[PDB]
């Protein structure tokens, strides 16, 4: 509606992980109908008010406060688009607030904390409306879940073990669509954690499954790479009109 | 020296109750105006803030929100009562006259939160050696503005000053 | 949304000011009354018909 | 459903009409009444006049809600407190040493020197809204609540907010510059990162906000038939329980 | 001897004051000091390299609390560093106002410090001062189960029962004789404006309309005076 005349959809590759992509009608409303990905949260919404009283004792000062003309040295930060103070040291700027992100302090849910180097511009953003998932945090090119916390998942079915507890441990994180910009992402820990042939060993995160991409009628169907890219797309309309 | 060297230890005292306030006037270091030479200044209440009073002209004067009274729902109704003058009790900035009163004038604008996340207190140096504190209750940021000017005539010079673009300064200040 | 969207909106000010006619040349009128509003906490018991 | 991620400064291309770029950006409220309120700031794509003055390619003249026509940017900042031009100059980079960024807004401050007092600044403004007969002391009153209730509502509606709320006007400037001149890229307007959701939320929170008002609008009604007769009142009487359902 | 006077002595005599900034969680303490209002001492350090500032809490003040229990304390001091800001660029003055409109000046400002925390706590008691200088149940509601609460029912009704009380007080039906008390009460109404409003004669007087007519349209005359509204005068004949 807002906005026509020569504009077309086709795929963007922000739709890997969070929007299925083998998953739309066989109609008129093919790429216009988005559906959502197989494990993919939603964000409700926050209000940054606690956040924002941390930030100003870490060393942070005031728009009506000083002058931004003898301040050309650090690194801007904006809260919901709107701008709150600067730091002079960026490095431990974004790393304390990631290691109390998952220490259980800061709600993983909505809290996005996104570092630019290009644009020099730190952007946060805890409004509803942004697509968010789970990943495998990669610390040293190695995987930081250990097998001891397999055990405890087990234990689930005869004491108490959530999945709050897990997201706690430090292990696992929401990553949205802005924090995944900037972070580096792996495929499985098992071929890129070898020292032997690797371009490059400084991942960050790394995906739960390779077939979380599907949807819900895009999972019924067996191998779906091994068949035709647009036939995969066909199941989704048939499994819905069908009869059981 | 004595500023690298000399290692002291006083008393720091808070005193609850006061009788005078206490406020920041920031002033511009860009300017660099000497302290030594004022004489005399009158600093009073803004008098801009007491002009404006009625307001009743709508939707005569326009609008894109229907901002009567807020409700954008219902219209007339002639009881807008909504725009009465309340030169706060103390939300009025300062006016700054030094040396008479062109001789040199400031104003600015009242700071909006002054103890939102943390507060301001003021140390002196007492005779005996001790240190008072002193609670600072708002914020001031004067700007400095230019004495005796009045362009005059703003809504008649402006239509045929765009129009074409041809013309001096020197032929306005002239006829004024 | 039905926890903090229905008390958000009730967090600023549902009630509006409202005063009384004047009427004067009616003996002593003195000051018109005025009535005003006012709400505290939104409740949402079980559904029942 | 699904909108585009709003209070961000977004840079599009849009060069089929008269204009050359776009700098869309809204200014929703939080959780309050969020109007909308889209900042239309857009280049025009014009070149050459005839013997005026012949660089009507340097002009901005943003499309500034509810306005009529479009009025240059540079105006507005006369209107903040600020009548120098070292003081804009701040608002839009903390770092003036560099020249290259110099020949683009050395042709727009020129705009600035046909306004010099504050006071002018607010006429100009609500000049072009409407037209309250011939007294210029009633259009400044309605440029006050539209440059803080209506123009960017998000950084604060309050009387001392135009302090913080000129810095963030030379941010969204300067941003739009940088795509403009070559050392900025476009934004992708099918980027999932710069779009948003809307699901029993904000949704939800607009239908129970609508007939809010329409709440009080029918006691308010009842009320005033309330000062014309002369009882006492009646509350659940005003209170509706179908209308809203 | 003047009102808005500002008393310029600072200004000629150089006055150095300093400036602290110190949080919410600092200055609740502060307010119940013990005496008249001392809250501790002062240790500064200067070496030939290093400038070490920090503000030692007193031993009767580390012992009170406010607006809440504060734990590890309430026992013993702990030790308050300041950091140094810089104060170039924006001059920095210090008025003041007495209660009887008098105004003064102090001086200018030349030091300006911060209260900020090193190596005394982490996260783990920051994260709980906030809950508890807060205690409140965030607005929201804390549900109800369920309630059946109706109306009262008083065989009537509230609004109209207050008016029949009022009502048989004093009834509009007056009776009438002699028009010359009406006539007389004109002059000290028609004395101050011209014309007037046919309703502002209706609460006056104590008369219909359909009796009021007959003496405006003995003595006066009716003239819609360019309101459309019904504006009645005297004759000036």
């Keep these: 509606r807002d906005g026509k005349l020569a504009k077309p959809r086709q795929l963007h590759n922000t739709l890997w992980g969070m929007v299925c992509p083998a998953e739309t009608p066989e109609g008129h409303a093919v790429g216009l109908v988005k559906n959502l990905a197989l494990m993919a949260y939603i964000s409700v919404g926050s209000q940054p008010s606690p956040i924002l009283e941390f930030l100003e004792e870490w060393s942070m000062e005031n728009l009506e ?62 409004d509803a409306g942004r697509i968010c998932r789970p990943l495998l945090i990669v610390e040293k090119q190695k995987l930081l879940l250990k097998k001891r916390h397999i055990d405890q998942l087990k234990e689930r079915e005869y004491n108490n073990y959530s999945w709050q507890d897990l997201v706690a441990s430090g292990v696992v994180e929401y990553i949205d669509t802005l924090e995944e910009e900037t972070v580096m992402l792996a495929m499985t820990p098992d071929d890129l954690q070898e020292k032997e042939v690797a371009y490059c060993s400084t991942y960050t995160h790394c995906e739960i499954h390779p077939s979380m991409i599907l949807g819900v009628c895009a999972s019924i169907i067996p191998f779906p790479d091994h068949n035709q890219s647009p036939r995969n797309t066909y199941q989704s309309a048939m499994g819905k009109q069908a009869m059981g | 020296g004595p500023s690298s060297q000399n290692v002291t230890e006083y008393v720091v005292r808070v005193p609850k109750n006061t009788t005078k306030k206490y406020n920041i006037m920031a002033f511009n270091a860009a300017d ?120 005059t005539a703003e809504e008649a010079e402006e239509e045929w000053e765009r129009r074409n673009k041809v013309l001096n300064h020197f032929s306005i200040m002239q006829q004024r | 949304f039905i926890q903090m969207s229905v008390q958000r909106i009730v967090e600023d000010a549902p009630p509006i000011d409202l005063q009384a006619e004047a009427q004067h040349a009616s003996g002593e009128v003195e000051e018109p009354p005025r009535y005003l509003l006012k709400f505290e906490q939104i409740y949402l018991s079980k559904p029942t018909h | 459903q699904e909108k585009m991620a709003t209070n961000t400064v977004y840079v599009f291309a849009k060069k089929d009409s008269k204009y050359a770029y776009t700098g869309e950006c809204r200014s929703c409220l939080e959780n309050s009444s969020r109007p909308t309120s889209t900042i239309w700031v857009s280049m025009l794509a014009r070149g050459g006049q005839g013997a005026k003055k012949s660089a009507i390619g340097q002009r901005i003249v943003a499309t500034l809600p509810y306005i009529k026509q479009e009025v240059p940017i540079i105006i507005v900042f006369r209107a903040l407190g600020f009548v120098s031009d070292r003081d804009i100059l701040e608002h839009i980079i903390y770092d003036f040493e560099d020249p290259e960024m110099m020949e683009m807004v050395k ?50 509606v309050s009387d001392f907010c135009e302090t913080k709320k000129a810095y963030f006007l030379g941010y969204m400037v300067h941003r739009l510059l940088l795509a403009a001149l070559g050392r900025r890229e476009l934004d992708d307007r099918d980027h999932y990162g710069n779009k948003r959701l809307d699901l029993a939320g904000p949704l939800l929170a607009f239908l129970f906000r609508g007939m809010f008002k329409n709440l009080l609008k029918e006691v308010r009604i009842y009320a005033q ?12 009487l005003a209170i509706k329980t179908r209308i809203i359902s | 001897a003047e009102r808005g006077e500002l008393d310029l002595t600072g200004a000629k005599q150089n006055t150095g004051v300093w400036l602290v900034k110190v949080p919410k969680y600092l200055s609740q303490q502060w307010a119940k000091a013990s005496g008249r209002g001392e809250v501790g001492k ?49 001059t920095l003055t210090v008025f003041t106002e007495s209660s009887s409109d008098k105004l003064s000046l102090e001086g200018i400002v030349v030091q300006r410090a911060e209260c900020r925390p090193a190596a005394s706590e982490n996260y783990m008691r920051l994260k709980r001062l906030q809950i508890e200088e ?75 309309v359909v009796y009021l007519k007959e003496i405006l349209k003995e003595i006066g005359v009716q003239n819609v005076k360019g309101i459309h509204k019904n504006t009645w005068e005297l004759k000036p004949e």
């Design chain 1, 65 to 126: 406060e000083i002058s931004p003309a003898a301040i050309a040295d650090a690194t801007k930060i904006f809260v919901n688009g709107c701008w709150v103070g600067i730091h002079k040291d960026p490095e431990q700027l974004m790393n304390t607030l990631r290691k109390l992100r998952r220490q259980m302090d800061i709600i993983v849910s909505e809290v996005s904390m996104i570092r630019d180097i290009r644009e020099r511009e730190i952007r946060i953003y805890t």
């Design chain 5, 42 to 90: 002062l240790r500064i350090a200067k070496t030939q390299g290093r400038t070490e500032v920090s503000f030692t809490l007193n031993e009767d003040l580390a012992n009170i609390h406010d607006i809440g229990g504060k734990p590890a304390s309430v026992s013993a001091p702990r030790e308050h560093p300041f950091v140094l800001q810089s104060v170039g660029g924006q």
């Design chain 2, 32 to 151: 660099k105006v000497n302290f030594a030479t004022w004489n005399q200044a009158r600093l009073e209440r803004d008098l801009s803030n007491k002009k404006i009073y009625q307001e009743e002209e709508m939707p005569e004067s326009g609008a894109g929100s229907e901002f009567n009274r807020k409700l954008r729902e219902e219209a007339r109704r002639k009881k807008y009562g909504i725009v009465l003058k309340e030169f706060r009790p103390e939300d009025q900035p300062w006016l700054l006259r030094v040396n008479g009163k062109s001789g040199r004038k400031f104003k600015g604008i009242k700071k909006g939160g002054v103890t939102e996340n943390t507060s301001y207190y003021i140390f002196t140096q007492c005779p005996d050696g001790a240190f008072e504190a002193f609670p600072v209750h708002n914020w001031y940021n004067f700007t400095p503005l230019a004495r005796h000017r009045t362009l």
């Design chain 4, 107 to 156: 042709p727009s401050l020129d705009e600035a020197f046909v306004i010099q007092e504050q006071n002018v600044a607010l006429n100009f403004i609500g000049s072009r809204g409407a037209k309250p007969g011939v007294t210029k002391e009633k259009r400044i009153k309605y440029a006050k609540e539209v440059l803080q209730k209506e123009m960017l509502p998000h950084v604060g």
């Design chain 5, 134 to 208: 807060s205690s409140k149940p965030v607005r929201l509601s804390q549900q109800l189960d369920k309630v059946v609460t109706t109306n009262y029912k008083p065989v009537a009704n509230h609004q109209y029962n207050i008016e029949y009380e009022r009502k048989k007080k004093e009834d509009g039906k007056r009776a009438r004789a002699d028009k010359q008390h009406v006539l007389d009460m004109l002059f000290s109404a028609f004395e101050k404006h011209q014309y007037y409003n046919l309703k502002d004669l209706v609460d006056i007087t104590k008369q219909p």
């Design chain 4, 225 to 236: 038939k309330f000062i014309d007769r002369g009882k006492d009142f009646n509350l659940e």
